[PDB]
Assembly symmetry: C2
Homo-oligomer: 217 residues x 2
């Protein structure tokens, strides 16, 4: 409410950061507090991979070396937030940052450290619209397919991804079987990426509470 719990949470992640390593870094206000923590040890870290322009400019300014995903075989950790997280640590992500870059850095990372306030934990994924990046010539097609799956896809007009793709935000779904829905949407021709992190979810969850953050991994 309370990006004091956002900050508790973000600094709480610093314990996962090893001397000599390259750190995977997401974005958000709660990650940006983790980047404030991380600069506290700029000297002891080899560098960072980031899924966000804002974070990388911030890491650079702290003098932390930036690596390209194609320069690493893996990352020890990826520290990011989520839009929703369920009891099984499956997430909706990409509602407010670079969906495809987040999914790719999280894929290369050994451990995903999810960093949230009290509002992210849910029963059933899906209240928060599910972002789906779509090749532009396919947008009406993919949208027909999401309707068949019982979603209500809404095109995010006036913007594109760095790649030039469009975003559909899918409302109204009760996402029981996230792994299955991830499968289903990844199968639709014209889909680039789907904001269900269900086959690879959070490994540690750190939730900001009033008394200083809850490491409920």
């Amino acid at each position: 409410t309370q990006d004091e719990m956002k900050k508790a949470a973000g600094w709480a992640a610093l314990k996962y950061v090893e001397k000599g390593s390259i750190v995977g870094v997401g974005t958000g206000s709660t990650v940006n507090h983790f980047i404030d923590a991380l600069g506290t040890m700029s000297e002891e870290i080899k560098g960072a991979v980031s899924s966000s322009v804002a974070s990388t400019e911030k890491l650079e300014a702290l003098g932390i070396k930036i690596f390209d995903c194609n320069e690493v075989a893996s990352l020890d950790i990826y520290v990011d937030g989520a839009d929703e997280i369920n009891a099984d640590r499956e997430m909706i992500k990409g509602g407010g940052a670079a969906l495809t870059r987040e999914k790719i850095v999280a894929a290369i990372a050994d451990k995903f450290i999810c960093i949230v306030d009290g509002t992210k934990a849910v029963d059933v994924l899906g209240t928060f619209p599910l972002p789906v990046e779509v090749i532009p010539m396919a947008r009406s097609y993919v949208a027909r397919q999401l309707v068949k799956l019982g979603g209500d896809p809404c095109y995010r007009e006036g913007v594109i991804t760095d790649n030039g793709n469009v975003i559909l935000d899918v409302y109204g779904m009760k996402i029981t079987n996230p792994k299955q829905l991830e499968d289903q949407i990844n199968a639709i021709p014209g889909v680039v990426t789907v904001g269900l992190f269900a086959h690879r979810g959070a490994d540690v969850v750190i939730t900001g509470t009033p008394e200083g953050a809850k490491i409920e991994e």
Copy 2:
């Protein structure tokens, strides 16, 4: 490969063209014969949706109207060649054409008519390298995962797709379960499109033989 067999196959596809329809049209030498055929019936069709720059030029030469995929809700047919086709009518496609375009136009069309000479049928897919379009920052990652699936991914250097993505051509696979492999690749973060046409394959195969066109419905 014989051009007269390509020619026979492309002309035979013309029987499948309903008057007053918008025709899905692919690319290649075999399809160029089909386009010739379609010329003979042009003032009898509303238009065409094409997956190829060169096919659009040819259809425009004939005065056939061009529609985009977002302008139609379905297509009756899509007429295209293939790199390889198994006896189950599953194809490798995209080796020398616009892979993502073709898979989306085929997803929209009701009926896929695959027009081939005798050199496209194979017992098992995989000799012909499988094209995978990939987000550039994900290239090494996706190649690591393709190697885990048994393949030899080769980066198609010097070039990008319309969308700015890279292509990995994957050698050395014995694609005994095309629907599974499509599912597996479709789920690697960073994959945009896989040249496996397995869940949605060909509905009609017209093969050009030394005798004439042979139709397999």
